[PDB]
Amino acid sequence: ANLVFHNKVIDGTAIKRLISRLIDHFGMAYTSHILDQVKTLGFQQA
Amino acid sequence: LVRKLSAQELQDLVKGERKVPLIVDFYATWCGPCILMAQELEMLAVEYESNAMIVKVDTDDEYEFARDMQVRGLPTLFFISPDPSKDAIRTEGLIPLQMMRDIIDNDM
Amino acid sequence: MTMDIERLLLSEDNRFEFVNSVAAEATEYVEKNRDEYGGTKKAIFHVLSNRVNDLGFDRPEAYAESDPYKPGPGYLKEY
Amino acid sequence: FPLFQLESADPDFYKIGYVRRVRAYGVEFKEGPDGFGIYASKDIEPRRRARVIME
Amino acid sequence: LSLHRCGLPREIAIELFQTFVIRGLIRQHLASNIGVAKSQIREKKPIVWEILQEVMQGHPVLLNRAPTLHRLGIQSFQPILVEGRTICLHPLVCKGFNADFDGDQMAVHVPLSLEAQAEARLLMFSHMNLLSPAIGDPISVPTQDMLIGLYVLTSGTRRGICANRYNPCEPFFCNSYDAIGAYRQKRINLDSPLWLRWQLDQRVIASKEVPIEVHYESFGNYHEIYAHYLIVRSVKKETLYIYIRTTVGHISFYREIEEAIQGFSQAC
Amino acid sequence: TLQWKCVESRRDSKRLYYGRFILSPLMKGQADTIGIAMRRALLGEIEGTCITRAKFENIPHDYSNIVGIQESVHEILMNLNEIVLKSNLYGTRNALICVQGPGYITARDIILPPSVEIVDNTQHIATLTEPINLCIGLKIERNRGYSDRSYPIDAVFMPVQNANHSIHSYGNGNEKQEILFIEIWTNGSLTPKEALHEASRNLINLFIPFLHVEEE
Amino acid sequence: TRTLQWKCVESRRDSKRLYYGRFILSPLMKGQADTIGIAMRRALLGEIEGTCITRAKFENIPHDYSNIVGIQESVHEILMNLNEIVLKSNLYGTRNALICVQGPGYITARDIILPPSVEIVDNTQHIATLTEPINLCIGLKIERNRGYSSYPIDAVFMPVQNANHSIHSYGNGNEKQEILFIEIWTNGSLTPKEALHEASRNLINLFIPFLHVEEETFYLTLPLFPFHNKLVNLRQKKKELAFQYIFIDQLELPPRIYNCLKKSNIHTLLDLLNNSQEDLIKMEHFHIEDVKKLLDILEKK
Amino acid sequence: ISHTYGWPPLVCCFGSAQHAFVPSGRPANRLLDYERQERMKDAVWAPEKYIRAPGGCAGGVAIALASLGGKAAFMGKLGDDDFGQAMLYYLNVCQVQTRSVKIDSKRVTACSTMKISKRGRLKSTCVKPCAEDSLSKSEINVDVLKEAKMFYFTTHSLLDKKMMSTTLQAIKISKQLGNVIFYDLNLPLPLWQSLEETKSLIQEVWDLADVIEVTKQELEFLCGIEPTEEFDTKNNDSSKFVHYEPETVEPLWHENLKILFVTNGTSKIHYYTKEHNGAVLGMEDVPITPFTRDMSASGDGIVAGLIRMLTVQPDLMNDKGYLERTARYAIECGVVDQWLLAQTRGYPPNGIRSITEREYRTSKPYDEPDGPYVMKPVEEREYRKL
Amino acid sequence: ATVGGELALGKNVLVAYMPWEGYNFEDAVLISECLVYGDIYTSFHIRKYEVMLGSWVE
RNA sequence: CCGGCGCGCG
Ligand SMILES: Nc1ncnc2c1ncn2[C@@H]1O[C@H](CSCC[C@H](N)C(=O)O)[C@@H](O)[C@H]1O
Ligand SMILES: [Mg+2]
């Protein structure tokens, strides 16, 4: 996967834009799994 | 049933005569494998109701007698043949029951 | 199975027709062999696996899997 | 018991395709004096429908 | 829970799938007839739950909140047996349902015929409904707690006067695994700066700026120092080394997304 | 009875070992405690062997680069930090590198103290083009994870790269039972089974002293 | 004498059913104190067992929400008082006790006829008060358990009330040592020192199973005997031994080839037969001459 | 083929592969908490007289060393009978190298024909030895002796004249190949009287050993010391655990001796060199069962730990800190081995029945109707006045 | 719901205000087992229906 | 197994 390396911040606007770009590039099946992993990571760091 | 017998009683028993195999248990009260061998011997005596005799001699109380029999450790069993011509078998360690039965049915 | 479902629709002009054809194939499966389905084997899952297998990609039959670590009969996994 | 018992193409040829979402299933590229060709790397079992070979 | 799963109470599940449990009982010769099977179900026999768990596999259900304002107000999930008397719902599908956990309730429906089951599985599951039909924005986007967690994770180093008391007149890691391992052993903090060896192309989002400082050596090698990375180049060779100045949080976010993609690819 | 078993094992490369282990039956709450303690022990109580210091002989002028070596001094140190070693050494020992000239310097070109081995001999260190002898004096230590013009190497003593635990619960009525799963990733200097045994022994050794008594 | 020591730095009996103790453990290497503290806390809060009354039987009560003439407290209050009795025992099983007294008077915890394996912690614990001379016979049930649960009694088995620990830097960073303190609160059924020792023993018993032999390692007290029985059975109806039970040690191989097979994780004859020639060739110090001589040796078998 | 010798170094354990065989047992003192013993006397089993066995056979030490992650090979003879094959298989599955085990088809495992004299008092006069007593000098595997870096043997091998000759030959061959000789005394039963003949038997092997491990009782016996301490008394006075000065062990020292280990179980281990001496305290409040009371598993574990640590760092045999750490490691290994054996064998309630520690600590319901803990019929009540 | 002449509708419990692994997402509340086996929040509820006294119906 | 009135929850 040729993902860009974010190095500044991930806010509400950034995560919404990132997910939309992931659906276009990877599809809804790949992004559904990415959302499950990101949800755990956000819960784990909160 | 295994009976605790002293050195002189074993002296008499071997110097006497018998028609059944005699198994002598050399044991000490501080050995766990001795307790396991006691359980095995109790089961064997159940299997051999009257065709064999199993006895136990405490090593700590007959240390000189145990040395005279070249008992190098515990548990140790001596299979004494009723026939004076045949030789006695000394078994070292916690041997299984099948070995006991094989000895009694082959070289007893 | 979600990835397989997405892959199968990449070759379908209409998804409603895809759903209708899958339902018809599952109905045929149930009518032909009634007693093989409804438990660990589901007709729609079998249809999806067969359609994926027809492309040359190996998949378990009807996506049927069990837990090898169940500690004997009667024990039910608690979520 | 296991103990008792045309050339392959340049790997970079498929690798440059593979890193760019080119997929070949059940086939391998071979080169000969006549030229390049595509050959089944294993036995392709006939299925109900057409089987995907390359993308 | 997974994005495509929901938790069903045992009583609701045994009520909804009663006919399927009866069929499962009769099929394996554990019930003489329908009446005996119904009596067994009424007695809550321990074998009833095995058959219920077996027959719920692969059979979807439809959840629905009360004020259905759009089509995402009813969705399809794969039911699993959970203890208690409540319905377990994924946190990422609450925005579509407009649901919060302060007293809300939901209705559950079981598609019976094969066509309805196929419709529910292939059209109504949440993993093919990631976009809202109104304008096309994603609907299952992390919110609140997950958003705060990601924001804290990707909030970078303290910089400038917030990092040093005085005017200034960091560890180097071979790979990201080394940095995260050092973080696990409490050697570094979540936002402590570090230098990461980069062995890929330049793909770090940063301001389009020239190097702050170029350290040119008389032997040919020169070091270009940017705001967020260091690049080592030479005039003799074609070598090019890249080191990224970042934290464990950015590395963790990147690894989480990368590992999600790689795991999904490998599992298929 | 309480038994353990290895349910999965793999060796992706010489420096990537994976294993999955099981432990059942367990009582309620025991599996979580065991998993937490075992994960902490695996991540930090297991001793690893690493190069902790490098001395550059032959008078390199203490510059950023050495004439004839493709890699820089910092690049050489970074390469040295990646070498995976195993040993039983007590204290600190010394290793030496003496490569005649042109060619590739790998882990195989390290003269080791008696108990030290090398997991991967193909790990690159430096590339030599012109015929100049290179002399590096390595310092090798063995330490826990939770613990003169010579350049230090910031070694991280993590033979176990990652560790995880998970719990599976089962029950039929009033009697319950849970199963513990432990995943171990090691860098090849030690097998996941060896890591599990070492973690158990280290934990037990940590909890033996509370039962100590003193002579009167 | 010991380099690493532990001691009780404070012991306190605030009441008959609330004991306190603080313990020290120094010097510890960096990171050891955290592991010991977390594991000890979890063991103290979850792994220590206690004994309490779990079932009381009455005779003339319609339901546990009724009163008795001559007793000030209702049945519910009597059951609540019975749930607060602290007992001690080292044994398992459902023991039974008896309350058989005649009023009037105060029924304290010393009025319980206990089996010899169970003791009362607090004699002054109150159960009920009798105002007139009425008969009162209560049959009790006592067992030892962990966690928490004829009228059933909701028994809480945990005897450790609370726990705490702290970690302090020992001093100069020679080895960056640490000092560990542990605080334990118990209900008197066992002292804080006893709780500490029991937690250590329980933790050791929890970690020691991984040091046993792996599951399915010996053929199935004395693992030798079942295999001897298998050999005895194989002696009759001679069928020889399987290749899995035959090891490469008993086959005459050159020491170099034996070592080559051993470090390649080859131990039994079945593994040797399952191996392929190419894989053995891949392993160094193993040439085609070794391959053919090993094949000849196997053929001789 | 020195390039095929890996790590850790191989250890050769020479002797017999006996099954649960104990050489002897002497009265012993262990460190214990007696308030706990009084409190838990109804749930924790203890022997009335604490008697400790020094260890087991060489096969047991080989098995224990392998369990520690070390490389161990067993050198001995076993018969082709079912018992011998079972013992060989058991050694094989314990990762013990059995390529040095010689299998004899003309011998019986663990059985010896004995000629009893029936005229005076019975002697036994061994005639045909057992399988694990007939290893000839030609049957010694020299390849494992070249590969091994440490040679281990016990005094049980010196009881038979042919076995003694084989042991002497093996020790000499290992010495020529530059191996470290580890002599674990483990004094057998008949040798515990007439100290003089014990010295006569063990004098030659004693001078050929680099490391010697003896118990406190064995050291006192060899030094002609009568134990003046008190046994089976509920205290931990230092007189029961005395660190003898190097002058006491001076007569036993010789030219090539490097370390002498004096063990008191897992309670205390004393090490002696020519420049340093000291002791390390341990722990012996391990679970004990009537099936595991001899504490031979602890001795096997201690010896295995000592061998492991001496082999992994052979150049630190004179380092005081390394010797202390080695003693601590051996104590830990013995404790773990005893705990594991207690768990495996279980308590008494092939005819062998055992119960778990959970079943052992389970009491009777005490629901006998005649008992004072059951609601009797109202005819017989016996109320007590408040 | 009255103690010492005052209205007493609840309990005083130890409380923390922090996110915990999503189990207090939105308005969810994560509680301890002590509130359960301690009978901190146990209430009696009685219905009326228009059988032996003291029987456990089902 | 039918409708009105009142009180609530999301
Ligand atoms: N059946 C056949 N027999 C011989 N040549 C063929 C052929 N089919 C195609 N070709 C040749 O292959 C070319 C098509 S491109 C096919 C691959 C090509 N041979 C290569 O090596 O790059 C055409 O120019 C044609 O001349
Ligand atoms: Mg709401």
Write out the DSSP string of G55-111: EEE-SS-SSTT---TTBSS-HHHHHHHHHT--EE-S-BS-EEEEEEEESSEEEEGGG
- Is E232 in contact with F65 (Cβ distance < 8 A)? no
Written as six digits, the tokens of E252 are 């963790």
Written as six digits, the tokens of F122 are 């193909």
d(CA E65, C1' J6) / Å: 27
Is the distance from CB of G187 to CB of G88 less than 8 angstroms? no
Pocket test for ligand 1, best of D34, D38, D39 (most atoms within 8 A of CB): D34
Q: Which ligand is nearest to the CA of E67?
A: 2
Written as six digits, the tokens of D33 are 């004096």
Torsion angles phi and psi, residue F26, rounded to 5: -130, 155
Partners of G87 in the β-ladder: G51, G120
Q: Give the pairing type, strands H211-215 and H259-263.
A: parallel
Give CA–CA dist E255/E246, Å, rounded: 13
Torsion angles phi and psi, residue E25, rounded to 5: -65, -50
| Omega of the bond leading into G133 within 30 degrees of 0 (cis) | no
Neighbours of F178 (CB within 10 A): 21
Check residue E81 and report its DSSP letter. E
Rg of chain D in Å (alpha carbons): 15
Three-class DSSP category at E77: strand
Neighbours of I33 (CB within 10 A): 9
Give CA–CA dist H7/G294, Å, rounded: 25
Chain centroid to CA H95: 19
Closest by CA to G195, choosing from G40, G63, G69, is G40
Give CA–CA dist E57/E51, Å, rounded: 10
Query: Is E178 known as a binding-site position?
Result: no
Whether D36 lines ligand 1, by a CB cut-off of 6 Å, is yes
Position of tokens 């882990």?
Answer: F107
Give CA–CA dist H257/H277, Å, rounded: 14
Rg of chain B in Å (alpha carbons): 13
Judged on CB neighbours under 10 Å (0-12, 13-18, 19+), B50 is exposed
Give CA–CA dist G279/G290, Å, rounded: 13
Three-class DSSP category at E80: strand
Q: Count of alpha carbons within 13 Å of H53, Cβ hemisphere only?
A: 31
CB of E60 within 8 Å of a chain C CB? The answer is no
Judged on CB neighbours under 10 Å (0-12, 13-18, 19+), D21 is exposed
Partners of H337 in the β-ladder: none
Give CA–CA dist H332/H327, Å, rounded: 9
Q: What stretches of F100-159 adopt beta strand conformation (E)? A: 103-106, 110-111, 117-118, 124-128, 134-144, 150-152
Give CA–CA dist H297/H342, Å, rounded: 10
Is the distance from CB of H214 to CB of H23 less than 8 angstroms? no
In chain D, breaks (C-N over 2.5 A) are found after 5
Give CA–CA dist H314/B51, Å, rounded: 59
Is the distance from CB of A46 to CB of I19 less than 8 angstroms? yes
Position of tokens 């105002």?
Answer: G131
Give CA–CA dist H77/F12, Å, rounded: 42
H134-138: which pairs have CB atoms within 8 A and are 24 or more residues apart? H134/H77, H134/H104, H134/H107, H134/H162, H134/H163, H135/H75, H135/H76, H135/H77, H135/H102, H135/H163, H135/H166, H136/H162, H136/H166, H137/H165, H137/H166, H137/H169
Give CA–CA dist E135/H93, Å, rounded: 68
Give CA–CA dist B57/B74, Å, rounded: 12
Give CA–CA dist G99/H383, Å, rounded: 9
Give CA–CA dist H6/H332, Å, rounded: 26
Pocket test for ligand 1, best of D36, D38, D39, D54 (most atoms within 8 A of CB): D36
Give CA–CA dist G86/G189, Å, rounded: 7
Amino acid sitting at position D20: R
Q: Which residues are within 7 Å of strand J by their Cβ atom?
A: E 66-67, 99-100, 102-104
Written as six digits, the tokens of F111 are 């003269």
Q: Output the 3-class SS for H56-103.
A: CCHHHHHHHHHHCCCEEEEEEEEECCHHHHHHHHHHHHCCCECCCEEE
Catalytic choice (B22, B24, B34, B53)? B34
Written as six digits, the tokens of F208 are 């033996």
| Nucleotide nearest the Cα atom of E98 (by C1') | J10
Three-class DSSP category at C40: coil
Can you say whether the dihedral through the CA atoms of E88, E91, E96, E97 is positive or negative?
A: positive
Written as six digits, the tokens of H110 are 């663990």
Is the distance from CB of E46 to CB of F173 less than 8 angstroms? yes
Q: Which ligand is nearest to the CA of E89?
A: 2
Is the distance from CB of H247 to CB of H225 less than 8 angstroms? no
Rg of chain F in Å (alpha carbons): 22
Is the distance from CB of E130 to CB of A23 less than 8 angstroms? yes
Closest by CA to H55, choosing from H273, H330, H351, is H330
Written as six digits, the tokens of G145 are 């358990």
Check residue C49 and report its DSSP letter. H
Partners of F185 in the β-ladder: F18, F162
Amino acid sitting at position H42: D
Check residue E109 and report its DSSP letter. E
Q: How many helices (H) and strands (E) does chain I have?
A: 1, 2
Give CA–CA dist F176/F181, Å, rounded: 17
Give CA–CA dist F194/C63, Å, rounded: 36
Give CA–CA dist B86/H113, Å, rounded: 9
Partners of H263 in the β-ladder: H215, H269
Closest by CA to H172, choosing from H14, H353, H60, H334, is H14
Torsion angles phi and psi, residue H216, rounded to 5: -65, -45
Give CA–CA dist A26/A46, Å, rounded: 27
Angstrom CA distances, G132 to E36, G61, G68, G103, H384, stand at: 56, 18, 11, 6, 14
Q: What is the nearest CA distance from I36 to chain E, expressed in angstroms?
A: 14
Partners of H151 in the β-ladder: H12, H181
DSSP letter for each residue of H192-206:
GS-HHHHHHHHHHHH
Amino acid sitting at position G206: L
- Is E23 in contact with C38 (Cβ distance < 8 A)? yes
In chain B, breaks (C-N over 2.5 A) are found after none
Closest by CA to G81, choosing from G105, G101, G52, G60, is G52
Can you say whether the dihedral through the CA atoms of F33, F36, F39, F45 is positive or negative?
A: negative
Is the distance from CB of I54 to CB of G58 less than 8 angstroms? no
Is the distance from CB of H152 to CB of H11 less than 8 angstroms? yes
- The H or E element containing residue F162 is strand F160-171
Which residues in chain E are closer than 8 Å to C20, comparing Cβ atoms? Answer: 115
Torsion angles phi and psi, residue H36, rounded to 5: -65, -40
d(CA E74, C1' J2) / Å: 33
Q: Output the 3-class SS for G81-92.
A: HHHCCCEECCCE
- Is D49 in contact with C50 (Cβ distance < 8 A)? no
Has B88 been annotated as catalytic? no
Partners of B88 in the β-ladder: H114
Is the distance from CB of F141 to CB of F41 less than 8 angstroms? no
Three-class DSSP category at G299: helix
G106-110: which pairs have CB atoms within 8 A and are 24 or more residues apart? G106/G130, G106/H386, G107/G136, G107/H386, G109/G85
Give CA–CA dist H110/B99, Å, rounded: 10
Who's near C41: CB < 8 A, 6+ residues apart? C61, C62, C64
Protein footprint on strand J: which nucleotides are under 7 Å from a CB?
A: 9-10
Can you say whether the dihedral through the CA atoms of E152, E155, E157, E159 is positive or negative?
A: negative
Give CA–CA dist H98/G247, Å, rounded: 9
Is the distance from CB of G72 to CB of G128 less than 8 angstroms? yes
Neighbours of A41 (CB within 10 A): 20
Q: Give the pairing type, strands H71-79 and H268-272.
A: unpaired
- In total, chain I counts a number of residues equal to 58
Check residue H109 and report its DSSP letter. T
Three-class DSSP category at G10: strand
Judged on CB neighbours under 10 Å (0-12, 13-18, 19+), H11 is buried
Closest by CA to F53, choosing from F122, F141, F157, is F141
Give CA–CA dist E111/E120, Å, rounded: 8
Supply the angle between the helices H58-67 and H82-93 in degrees, to the nearest 10.
Answer: 30
Written as six digits, the tokens of I13 are 């419990």
Q: How many helices (H) and strands (E) does chain D have?
A: 1, 3
Neighbours of E31 (CB within 10 A): 23
Rg of chain I in Å (alpha carbons): 18
Is the distance from CB of I58 to CB of E178 less than 8 angstroms? no
Is the distance from CB of B33 to CB of B3 less than 8 angstroms? no
Select from C67, C69, C75 the Cβ nearest to the Cβ of F172.
Answer: C75
Has B77 been annotated as catalytic? no
Q: What stretches of chain E adopt beta strand conformation (E)? A: 5-9, 61-64, 74-82, 107-109, 172-173, 194-198, 213-216, 222-225, 229-233, 240-246
Q: What is the resolution of this structure in A?
A: 2.6
Which residues in chain I are closer than 8 Å to A44, comparing Cβ atoms? Answer: 21
Q: What does the CA dihedral F51, F54, F57, F62 come to, rounded to 10 degrees?
A: 160
- Chains A and F are touching, with contact defined as 3 or more CB–CB pairs separated by less than 8 Å: no
Three-class DSSP category at F11: strand
Give CA–CA dist G98/G248, Å, rounded: 67
Q: What stretches of chain G adopt beta strand conformation (E)? A: 5-15, 18-28, 50-57, 87-88, 95-102, 105-108, 112-113, 119-120, 126-130, 135-145, 151-152, 160-169, 178-186
Is the distance from CB of E140 to CB of E3 less than 8 angstroms? yes
| Nucleotide nearest the Cα atom of E105 (by C1') | J10
Written as six digits, the tokens of C22 are 């899958």
Written as six digits, the tokens of H282 are 């341990």
C-alpha of residue D35 to centroid of ligand 1, in Å: 7
Chain centroid to CA H147: 25
Angstrom CA distances, E73 to E97, E99, E108, E130, H27, stand at: 5, 10, 12, 13, 81
Neighbours of A16 (CB within 10 A): 16
End-to-end CA distance of chain H: 90
Closest by CA to H350, choosing from G228, I56, C20, E262, is G228
Q: Find the angle CA(D6)-CA(D7)-CA(D12) to the nearest 5 degrees.
A: 140
